[PDB]
Amino acid sequence: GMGIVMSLIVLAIVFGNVLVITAIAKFERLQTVTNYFITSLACADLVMGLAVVPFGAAHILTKTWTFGNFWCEFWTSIDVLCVTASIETLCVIAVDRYFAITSPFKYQSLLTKNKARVIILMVWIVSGLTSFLPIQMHWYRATHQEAINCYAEETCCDFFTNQAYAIASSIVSFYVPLVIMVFVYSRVFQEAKRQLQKIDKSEGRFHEHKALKTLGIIMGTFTLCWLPFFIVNIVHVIQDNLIRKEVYILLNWIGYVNSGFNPLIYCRSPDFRIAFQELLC
Amino acid sequence: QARKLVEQLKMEANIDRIKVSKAAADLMAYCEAHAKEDPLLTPVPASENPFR
Amino acid sequence: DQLRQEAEQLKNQIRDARKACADATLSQITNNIDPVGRIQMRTRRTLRGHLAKIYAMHWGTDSRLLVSASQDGKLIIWDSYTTNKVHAIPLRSSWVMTCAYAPSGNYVACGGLDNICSIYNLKTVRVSRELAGHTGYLSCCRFLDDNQIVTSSGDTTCALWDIETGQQTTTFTGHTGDVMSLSLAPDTRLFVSGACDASAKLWDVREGMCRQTFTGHESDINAICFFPNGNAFATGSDDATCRLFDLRADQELMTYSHDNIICGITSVSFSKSGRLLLAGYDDFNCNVWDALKADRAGVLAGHDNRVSCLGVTDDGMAVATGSWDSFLKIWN
Amino acid sequence: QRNEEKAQREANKKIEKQLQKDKQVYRATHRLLLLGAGESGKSTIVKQMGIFETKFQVDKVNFHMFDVGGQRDERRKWIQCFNDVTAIIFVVASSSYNMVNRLQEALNLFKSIWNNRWLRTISVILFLNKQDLLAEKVLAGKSKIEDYFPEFARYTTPEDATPEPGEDPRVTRAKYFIRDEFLRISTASGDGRHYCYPHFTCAVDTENIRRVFNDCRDIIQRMHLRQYELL
Ligand SMILES: Nc1nc2c(ncn2[C@@H]2O[C@H](COP(=O)(O)OP(=O)(O)OP(=O)(O)O)[C@@H](O)[C@H]2O)c(=O)[nH]1
Numbered sequence: 055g056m057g058i059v060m061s062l063i064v065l066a067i068v069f070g071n072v073l074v075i076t077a078i079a080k081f082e083r084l085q086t087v088t089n090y091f092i093t094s095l096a097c098a099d100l101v102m103g104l105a106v107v108p109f110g111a112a113h114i115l116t117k118t119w120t121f122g123n124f125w126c127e128f129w130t131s132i133d134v135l136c137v138t139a140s141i142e143t144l145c146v147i148a149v150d151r152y153f154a155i156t157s158p159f160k161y162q163s164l165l166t167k168n169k170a171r172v173i174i175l176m177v178w179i180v181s182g183l184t185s186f187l188p189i190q191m192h193w194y195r196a197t198h199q200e201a202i203n204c205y206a207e208e209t210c211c212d213f214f215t216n217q218a219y220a221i222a223s224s225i226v227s228f229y230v231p232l233v234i235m236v237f238v239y240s241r242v243f244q245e246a247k248r249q250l251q252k253i254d255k256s257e258g259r260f261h262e263h264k265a266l267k268t269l270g271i272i273m274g275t276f277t278l279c280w281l282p283f284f285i286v287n288i289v290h291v292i293q294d295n296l297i298r299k300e301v302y303i304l305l306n307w308i309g310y311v312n313s314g315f316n317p318l319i320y321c322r323s324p325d326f327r328i329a330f331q332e333l334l335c
Numbered sequence: 336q337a338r339k340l341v342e343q344l345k346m347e348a349n350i351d352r353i354k355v356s357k358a359a360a361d362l363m364a365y366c367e368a369h370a371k372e373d374p375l376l377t378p379v380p381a382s383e384n385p386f387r
Numbered sequence: 388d389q390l391r392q393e394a395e396q397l398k399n400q401i402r403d404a405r406k407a408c409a410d411a412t413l414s415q416i417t418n419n420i421d422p423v424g425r426i427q428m429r430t431r432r433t434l435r436g437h438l439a440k441i442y443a444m445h446w447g448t449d450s451r452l453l454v455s456a457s458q459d460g461k462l463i464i465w466d467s468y469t470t471n472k473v474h475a476i477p478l479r480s481s482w483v484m485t486c487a488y489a490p491s492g493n494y495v496a497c498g499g500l501d502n503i504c505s506i507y508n509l510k511t512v513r514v515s516r517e518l519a520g521h522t523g524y525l526s527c528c529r530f531l532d533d534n535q536i537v538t539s540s541g542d543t544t545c546a547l548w549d550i551e552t553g554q555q556t557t558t559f560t561g562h563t564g565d566v567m568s569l570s571l572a573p574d575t576r577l578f579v580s581g582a583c584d585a586s587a588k589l590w591d592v593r594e595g596m597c598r599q600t601f602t603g604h605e606s607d608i609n610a611i612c613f614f615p616n617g618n619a620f621a622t623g624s625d626d627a628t629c630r631l632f633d634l635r636a637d638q639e640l641m642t643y644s645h646d647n648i649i650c651g652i653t654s655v656s657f658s659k660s661g662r663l664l665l666a667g668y669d670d671f672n673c674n675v676w677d678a679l680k681a682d683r684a685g686v687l688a689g690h691d692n693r694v695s696c697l698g699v700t701d702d703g704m705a706v707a708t709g710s711w712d713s714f715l716k717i718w719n
Numbered sequence: 720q721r722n723e724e725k726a727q728r729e730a731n732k733k734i735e736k737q738l739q740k741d742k743q744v745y746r747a748t749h750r751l752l753l754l755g756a757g758e759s760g761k762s763t764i765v766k767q768m769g770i771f772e773t774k775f776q777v778d779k780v781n782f783h784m785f786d787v788g789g790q791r792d793e794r795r796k797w798i799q800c801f802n803d804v805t806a807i808i809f810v811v812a813s814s815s816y817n818m819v820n821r822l823q824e825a826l827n828l829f830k831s832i833w834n835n836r837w838l839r840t841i842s843v844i845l846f847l848n849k850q851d852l853l854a855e856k857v858l859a860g861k862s863k864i865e866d867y868f869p870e871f872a873r874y875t876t877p878e879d880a881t882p883e884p885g886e887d888p889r890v891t892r893a894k895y896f897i898r899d900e901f902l903r904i905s906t907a908s909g910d911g912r913h914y915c916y917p918h919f920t921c922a923v924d925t926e927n928i929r930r931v932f933n934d935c936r937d938i939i940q941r942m943h944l945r946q947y948e949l950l
């Protein structure tokens with residue numbers, strides 16, 4: 055029953071991301087500074103849909119981790135790495151649009167291909183420092199009976215953490231990008247409204263929905279997909295025996311689903327649509 | 336500019352023209368004769384191609 | 388009254404004189420030959436380095452080096468074999484519309500919206516001569532020799548220059564619209580030009596007066612090129628038609644058009660034998676025709692903007708195309 | 720032969736270093752085309768603030784203006800070259816409504832420019848020149864606009880209008896009628912990809928170099944907003 059859905063999710067995540075990557079790679083008219091961030095985001099989503107989802111589905115359905123403890127730790131590390139590096143690229147895209155709209159004269163000098171590469175490697179390094187380093191060095195393990203038994207067992211792979219790691223990772227992965235995106239998009243909306251009023255005041259008699267709809271889609275999908283999990287992540291650590299494991303896994307998978315929506319949001323340009331027609335059909 | 340146009344028209348009005356059949360035959364003969372050494376028309380092997 | 392009546396009578400005599408010559412259409416004799424078939428070409432090289440659109444291009448006589456011009460104000464000389472830039476000349480004026488490459492390979496010409504033609508010395512790079520006297524923008528220029536050059540401009544006039552003294556040896560008049568292109572004969576004894584009044588004329592370089600006039604088009608003519616024989620030429624206008632004219636018969640022979648294309652034509656060129664006719668269009672691609680049958684034999688696609696330049700090597704080994712995407716491509 | 724390939728590569732690498740140094744300059748400068756109907760005080764406008772090129776800088780931004788005077792022809796086939804400029808500056812004498820008229824010829828030229836196939840994404844900055852003597856001849860009863868433009872009879876000043884301090888109300892009607900004549904053509908076929916920015920300019924004006932700055936800033940901002948599906 056659940057296998058068909060859990061496989062359809064995998065195919066949906068893989069297909070769109072690989073299509074976007076190959077469309078950007080094959081055609082030379084899409085090679086833009088903005089598209090490098092989209093390429094990085096697509097790579098992160100593809101790695102997520104290729105590695106994290108199938109093994110989580112197998113663990114849920116089989117109700118047993120048939121691999122070793124080393125593979126459980128590796129799977130957790132790659133999970134955190136893929137989740138952190140995907141959210142933080144949306145912040146970079148928002149900041150790029152902010153600089154493009156608010157400061158049009160200096161935008162060309164502000165960003166260059168070398169600067170884009172430096173930023174991308176910086177974000178990937180920061181994402182990798184918070185996932186592999188604190189997990190492989192065993193700085194995140196809990197110190198109660200259930201956690202100790204889970205760590206000792208060879209077939210049980212679960213998630214138990216301290217409070218320090220939970221708040222630190224949650225803040226770094228989600229909360230810092232959120233306020234930046236909110237501020238940036240509010241300023242962009244204000245500028246768009248100002249320009250619309252300026253247009254109306256000059257030639258109105260001769261002859262906000264669009265911006266509102268665009269910003270609403272962009273912010274709503276991300277917030278609705280990733281907020282409940284990053285609230286319960288703090289809550290279950292602060293007070294014990296309030297959040298059931300089933301709710302935790304359900305919210306985590308709802309967050310995972312977001313990887314299949316990004317090509318539908320950031321790749322609707324007419325140019326992208328043309329390439330997709332030549333590539334397919 | 337009235338006299339200039341008439342003088343030019345009279346100059347090029349008195350010329351000897353041949354029937355179009357001869358011109359078509361000449362063009363066809365030239366093409367048939369020189370079709371052998373036409374690298375675009377007749378592809379060349381990769382040994383003799385400097386752009387491959 | 389008398390002048391207008393006299394001109395009408397003379398023109399009618401010419402029109403009926405060539406009406407008796409046409410006893411059979413060109414397609415009638417060439418109706419009994421096998422077609423060339425399907426021709427497929429693939430890009431071999433792509434040349435990058437120009438910061439803006441490309442308006443001009445000219446192959447070298449050695450079939451190895453070519454020059455190109457761009458709106459950013461550079462004049463780059465390439466190396467098609469190894470794909471290496473050899474020279475890069477910064478132009479005083481950014482608006483450039485044409486370029487030429489000397490037959491001996493020792494000079495390069497240039498010109499545009501400043502009404503000035505410049506000659507550069509490549510084996511010494513700096514300006515060697517500036518030719519002035521045109522009252523309109525230059526459209527084309529071709530090297531007769533190492534010491535003389537013929538140019539066409541937008542003041543409805545062509546001129547033959549002397550590089551040593553910088554003076555117009557002779558001037559050609561008779562067009563009523565802007566002259567857009569020209570092409571020299573294999574023996575460099577005559578040349579043809581195409582203007583915006585939908586007419587093409589045949590000139591005598593040494594004597595200096597027109598010989599014949601052809602008026603088969605209905606819009607501005609953008610390109611022109613002799614048949615390799617030297618007794619025919621083809622033109623292309625922005626009404627989506629190419630037409631073939633014959634010098635000795637003083638009339639057109641065949642037209643090349645299709646009902647699925649409505650864009651303009653920017654450049655035409657023949658092949659080594661003359662069996663194929665290559666034409667560039669505003670539809671971002673290029674078309675390959677059969678000269679003796681008027682049917683398409685292939686398509687060249689791969690440019691993201693309109694094709695503005697076209698050329699074929701003297702040995703007929705490759706085709707170069709330039710476009711507003713700031714890229715050059717070699718086809719084979 | 721081995722050293723020949725090395726010799727070519729050394730020269731190619733040096734050239735590509737210079738090309739990168741010149742791409743920064745090319746992308747950091749803005750190109751403007753100056754166009755006028757004729758006898759419209761174009762020289763006075765360009766002076767106060769083949770082909771003639773002028774360069775000026777305001778607030779550390781480089782602007783580079785082009786004026787064509789060596790191609791004085793009724794037909795303009797060279798206009799497809801300027802399809803990547805930031806803006807087109809159009810200068811018209813608003814007072815030439817009775818002299819032979821010139822205002823209708825300028826309107827026809829503007830209509831021809833706006834609907835061109837290659838200038839389909841280029842905005843126009845409009846300078847309505849010679850306001851002082853226009854006001855003088857309008858206040859004087861020697862001639863009336865109604866005898867040259869019959870549509871002026873049934874025109875009234877819009878409620879959302881900004882008149883000059885102390886301006887006679889018979890000059891405001893003329894000014895706004897002449898401006899709306901151009902605005903009608905501007906908005907008739909505009910698909911939302913390019914607008915028009917009209918201004919009232921005199922001989923003694925000094926802020927003509929700030930208006931161009933502001934209009935270019937608006938042009939680029941609107942272009943980016945429309946690209947990101949926000950406008
Ligand atoms: N009162 C007044 N006089 C002006 C104004 N602009 C120009 N003039 C005068 O009108 C005279 C002729 O106009 P020009 O500025 O020379 O026009 P132009 O140089 O021919 O410009 P183009 O025709 O576009 O080439 C100038 O000598 C100025 O003194 C103006 O705005 N107000």
Ligand SMILES: CN[C@@H]1CCc2c(ccc(O)c2O)[C@H]1O
Pocket residue numbers: 130133134137138213220223224227306
């Ligand atoms: C087991 N799934 C993990 C659990 C905790 C966690 C995730 C993602 C990003 C973080 O910063 C986290 O702290 C989830 O993907």
